[PDB]
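Consider the following assembly input.
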Amino acid sequence: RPLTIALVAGETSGDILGAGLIRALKEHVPNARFVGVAGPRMQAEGCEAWYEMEELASRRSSHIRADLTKRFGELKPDVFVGIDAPDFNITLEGNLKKQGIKTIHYVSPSVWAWRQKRVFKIGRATDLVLAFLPFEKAFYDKYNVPCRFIGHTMADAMPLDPDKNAARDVLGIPHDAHCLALLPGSRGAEVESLSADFLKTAQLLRQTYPDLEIVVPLVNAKRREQFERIKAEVAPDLSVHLLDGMGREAMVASDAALLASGTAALECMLSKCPMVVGYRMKPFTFWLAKRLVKTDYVSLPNLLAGRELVKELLQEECEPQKLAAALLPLLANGKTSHAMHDTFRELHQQIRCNADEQAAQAVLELAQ
Amino acid sequence: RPLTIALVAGETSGDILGAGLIRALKEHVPNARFVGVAGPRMQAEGCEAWYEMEELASRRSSHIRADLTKRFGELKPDVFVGIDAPDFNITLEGNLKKQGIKTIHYVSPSVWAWRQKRVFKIGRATDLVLAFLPFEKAFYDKYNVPCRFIGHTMADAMPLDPDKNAARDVLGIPHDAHCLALLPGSRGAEVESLSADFLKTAQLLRQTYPDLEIVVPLVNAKRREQFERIKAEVAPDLSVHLLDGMGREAMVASDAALLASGTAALECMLSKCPMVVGYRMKPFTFWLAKRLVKTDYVSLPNLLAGRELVKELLQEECEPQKLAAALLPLLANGKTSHAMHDTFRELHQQIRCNADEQAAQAVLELAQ
Ligand SMILES: [Li+]
Ligand SMILES: [Li+]
Ligand code: NA
Ligand code: NA
Ligand code: NA
Ligand code: NA
């Protein structure tokens, strides 16, 4: 049997990675066979599409993963490559590993692996992880998880020395003018807050550069409508170039870029465009996340007790079946409930000090 | 001159703390004088209201803080107590400390102090911090910031052994039935996601407890309308008790509570109500926050370089004047811009490896 590779991609970006992998492999093994969940580019390179990538871009997903667990198990491919899409591929990679199939996960699932347990899962599910960036490999090295640093595909696609004048000709920007790119972000929460402040920033810069060109790449129609509506109020008399996409051209053309996304900062770096990164998130949200990172807890009872006195179910674990399972023993109103009751009473006593009087004493001691 | 205490409160909760402090102080110094920014309860206890607390609950706030900086400086009070409201009081406390006035900050500003620099600011601005909880004092101990643990006022207000049957009589809950409290949260992002899953959780629990009473404390009319609209779709045929406020009664009455807020978990603890805490936040948001906590950076260029190669302005620093100030040197398109250009070129080279070929090699090595 010729080399048989199973592939799963769940987004256009995965389809691009998959197509490039298939071509490079065919240079070494022109008789290789490719099958799995393929997008149009992977199919163009010859991947048999048991399912279309669009079908993964919940109940249907579960059924597909079950069917693929069965069929790949029967096929016994030489290698299975999960291309990103970790919510789908990590579990699938684990099911196939259970059957002795060699698995690779392509792209570090940084957002998905939000706690240590998920790092362990990646290690159990894969024989190797492919990471775009060096600090991602260093991360997995600390966990004894085999990881190969392969570089970033966007660095292969973008030249070391891009042509600023060419990008300006495409966008219609004069070569003698200073140019500022505003990238308020791709997500909604980002655009709302940061759009107004980015516009105000440009207004301030116009006082120094009265002929400053301002280019705003907008990723889709909804995001465009959002930015226009914000600009109508904040700065209706500010002239800017609103673009449909074309963020790469805007960055290559500009003399500086104001970015919301620390992720788009990579493409800005490869564009050789100096940048400033401004970002805001809800303080309450950041405080809660930081509390979890620093203590592994989120609720005050557990911080006061120093253990998981109270059951905390977070992120994917905050799910009806698990919540109900955690509440049943407590609704019983039996021994375990009385034990928690007693502990709550001790903690209550520990923080019951007549705070009003304490505060008054502290004032008086500082005053004397 | 009799004891002269300056107070600033910016919310109802601060007004309550202030009133209790004034009364306790008057027990030791009946001739004490109180002045500052007072709510109705502080005024009832005799606080002279230069400004009303409602006036702080941006341009107006700046003017008031300026006026208070002047007048308190002239008054030279024995002590100034900033009651919570850290966005306003920490700066004011610093201005007064500059003039030799002794300052206390009441309530740990946990959300406000989102990074180490702000901890240093609290220390510089205050002679003493008053913390409700022991782990808050331990935190400030690590920074050599004087902090007194005074206990939590809510623990003084709530009895060690509340009357479950009494709270049930208030709410109209039968004494023989099992009762579940659903507290989907006080904020909007919380209610949206967590409301549906909390309702589904209750539906599951009804399969075991067909006569389970379900009480839902809703903090205001908007939040109520939100929950009702979610319930119309998710579970219109589920009978629940929708309450206007009365979260304390609901928790004292219930046999178990399902809580979104790790903060309301304290009041649940003092109610002696066993609880399960379920919470979700946007993974992308948590990933970004965790990245910042772990590395002090948010943008990929700085993670790749290992320093602040690129200027990052986050939270209160993400502000037009500072953003424009950071962009001016780059728009100049001079020496500093060319230096960043050169560094970007070196980093580009470091991640330019022909990733497609690397991935293909890794597949082939694993297949052989
Ligand atoms: Li105490
Ligand atoms: Li390389
Ligand atoms: Na121009
Ligand atoms: Na959890
Ligand atoms: Na009942
Ligand atoms: Na910053």
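Chain B touches chain A through 136 residues (CB under 8 Å). Ask yourself how this observation constrains the way the partners meet.
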